[PDB]
Design a protein around this ligand. Structure first.
Ligand SMILES: CCC(C)(C)[C@H]1CCc2n[nH]c(C(=O)NC)c2C1
Length: 295
C-alpha cells in the first residue's frame, strides 16, 4: 500500500507480515496483513476472503478491506490493542480472574455461533488471533480457508505453525472440517486460560495427537464411531486410558469442567455446538468484567 504508514510490525501472520498502520488519509489505525502471492492468481481463495467482509459481529474483528494489487494481497483489519496470548502471558503469575475467563469464553462462543450459523469456519483459532480491548470485549480474527490456502506447513516466514489447538479429526486426516473444529480449539484455549498452561502442547502432529490421547484416552469405535477408518489412523497407535478429568483443569468448578468435556468430545458429532454451549449452566452467572491491560 501507499496510503499507509507502518507504525510497527504486529507480527509475522500465517500468510504474510502484519503491521499496525495509520490510514494516512483517514487517520484510522488498522492492522494490515500483507500476503505475498507465486504467479498463479488465487481467484477462488481471493473471493472467499472477500466475502468475509460482510461478516460483521461484536465478537469478530472487522475485515475492513481486501486489496489485490502488484502480486500482493492486503487484508485491512480493524485494530484492537492486545491479543489473548500476550494478555495470558502478562497474567501468568496471578491468572486471569474466573469471571473474566467466563466472559471471554461466552463472547467467543457468541462469535462462533454467529459465523457457524453463516457457514463460516475459523479453522485455526489460537490465543494469538483472539483480540481484546479495554472495555472487556474479545473478538475472533483471521478466519482461515483450508478450503483454499489449505494449511501451510509453516507460515510465510518459515516459522513453525502451532498445533496445540488442532482438533483430533484434522490430525487424523479428515478431508472435511466441520464447525466442531473451532469448538475444540476454543476448549483448548479455555483450559489454558484456567490452568495457565497449554492443554496439549504438541511439537509435531503425532506428538500433538498422542498428547491428546494420553489425556482423553486413545479413541476407539465406542467413543468415536468411524475413527479407525480415518486416513491417518493406525491400528498401531498406543492405547492410553482416559485420565481422570479433575486432574485436567483443577481450579475449574464442575460446571466449567462439564462444559469443557463437551467441547472436547472426540466425535465431532458429539462435540457441543457454540449455540448449545451458550446455554450451558456454566454461564448462569456470566458478567462482563473489565480487564487490566497494560498497553
Ligand atoms: C493474521 C492477523 C492478526 C495478526 C491475527 C491480526 C488480526 C486483526 C488485528 N487487529 N489488531 C490486531 C493486533 O494484534 N493488535 C495489537 C490484530 C491481529
Amino acid at each position: 500500500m501507499e496510503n499507509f504508514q507502518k507504525v510497527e510490525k504486529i507480527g509475522e501472520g500465517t500468510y504474510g507480515v502484519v503491521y499496525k498502520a495509520r490510514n494516512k488519509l483517514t487517520g484510522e489505525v488498522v492492522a494490515l496483513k500483507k500476503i505475498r502471492l507465486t504467479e498463479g492468481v488465487p481467484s477462488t481463495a481471493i473471493r472467499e476472503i472477500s466475502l468475509l467482509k460482510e461478516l460483521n459481529h461484536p465478537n469478530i474483528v472487522k475485515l475492513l478491506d481486501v486489496i489485490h494489487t502488484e502480486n500482493k494481497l492486503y487484508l485491512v483489519f480493524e485494530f484492537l490493542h492486545q491479543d489473548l496470548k500476550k494478555f495470558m502471558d502478562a497474567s501468568a503469575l496471578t491468572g486471569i480472574p474466573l469471571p473474566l475467563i467466563k466472559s471471554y469464553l461466552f463472547q467467543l462462543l457468541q462469535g462462533l455461533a454467529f459465523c457457524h450459523s453463516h457457514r463460516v469456519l475459523h479453522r485455526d483459532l489460537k490465543p494469538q488471533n483472539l483480540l481484546i480491548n479495554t472495555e472487556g470485549a474479545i473478538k475472533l480474527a483471521d478466519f482461515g480457508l483450508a478450503r483454499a490456502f489449505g494449511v501451510p506447513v509453516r507460515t510465510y516466514t518459515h516459522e513453525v505453525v502451532t498445533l496445540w489447538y488442532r482438533a483430533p479429526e484434522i490430525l487424523l486426516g479428515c478431508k472435511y472440517y466441520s464447525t466442531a473444529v473451532d469448538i475444540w480449539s476454543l476448549g483448548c484455549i479455555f483450559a489454558e486460560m484456567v490452568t495457565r498452561r497449554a492443554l496439549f502442547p504438541g511439537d509435531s502432529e503425532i506428538d500433538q495427537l498422542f498428547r491428546i490421547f494420553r489425556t482423553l484416552g486413545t479413541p476407539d469405535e465406542v467413543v468415536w464411531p468411524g475413527v479407525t477408518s480415518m486416513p491417518d489412523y493406525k491400528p498401531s497407535f498406543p492405547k492410553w486410558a482416559r485420565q481422570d478429568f479433575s486432574k485436567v483443569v483443577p481450579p475449574l468448578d464442575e460446571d466449567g469442567r462439564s462444559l469443557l468435556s463437551q467441547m472436547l468430545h472426540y466425535d465431532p458429532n458429539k462435540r457441543i455446538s457454540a449455540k448449545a454451549a451458550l446455554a450451558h449452566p456454566f454461564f448462569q452467572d456470566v458478567t462482563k468484567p473489565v480487564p487490566h491491560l497494560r498497553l
